[PDB]
Amino acid sequence: LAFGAIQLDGDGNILQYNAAEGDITGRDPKQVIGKNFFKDVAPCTDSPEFYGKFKEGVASGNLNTMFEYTFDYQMTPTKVKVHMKKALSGDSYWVFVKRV
Ligand SMILES: *C(=O)/C=C/c1ccc(O)cc1
């Protein structure tokens, strides 16, 4: 499948969410955009190795990291590879997701 892609602001609010990501997770993009990724849609990502690294990277202005993660919240459990990095646009961060 095509990468899943999510664009977040620095607080973790979902600004963009593509169809491929919804195919991985079962989420309808229009129902999650505008909600908080870490505190509402994806609470299983509220961990030091995901959310904690996100916040560090937002703070430092240097976010660019890759890691494996399990997406198992209100979906058939799926191992994924995550790449999060700062965007070019203002107050924007990308999360790219591939099944592994
Ligand atoms: C854990 O709560 C993960 C949930 C999640 C991951 C990625 C998404 O796009 C949606 C939900």
Curated annotation (Swiss-Prot):
PTM statement from Swiss-Prot or TrEMBL: The 4-hydroxycinnamic acid (p-coumaric acid) chromophore is covalently bound via a thioester linkage.
Keyword field: Chromophore, Photoreceptor protein, Receptor, Sensory transduction
Recorded superkingdom: Bacteria
Lineage: Bacteria, Pseudomonadati, Pseudomonadota, Gammaproteobacteria, Chromatiales
GO MF, one annotated term: identical protein binding
Role summary: Photoactive blue light protein. Probably functions as a photoreceptor for a negative phototaxis response.
Subunit structure: Monomer.
Coiled coil spans: none
A GO BP entry: phototransduction
Name of protein: Photoactive yellow protein
Family membership noted in the UniProt record: Belongs to the photoactive yellow protein family.
Domain PAS per the UniProt entry, residue ranges: 1-61
Transmembrane segments annotated in the record for this chain: none
Part of the whole protein covered: 26 to 125 of 125
Residues the record lists as S-(4-hydroxycinnamyl)cysteine modifications: C44
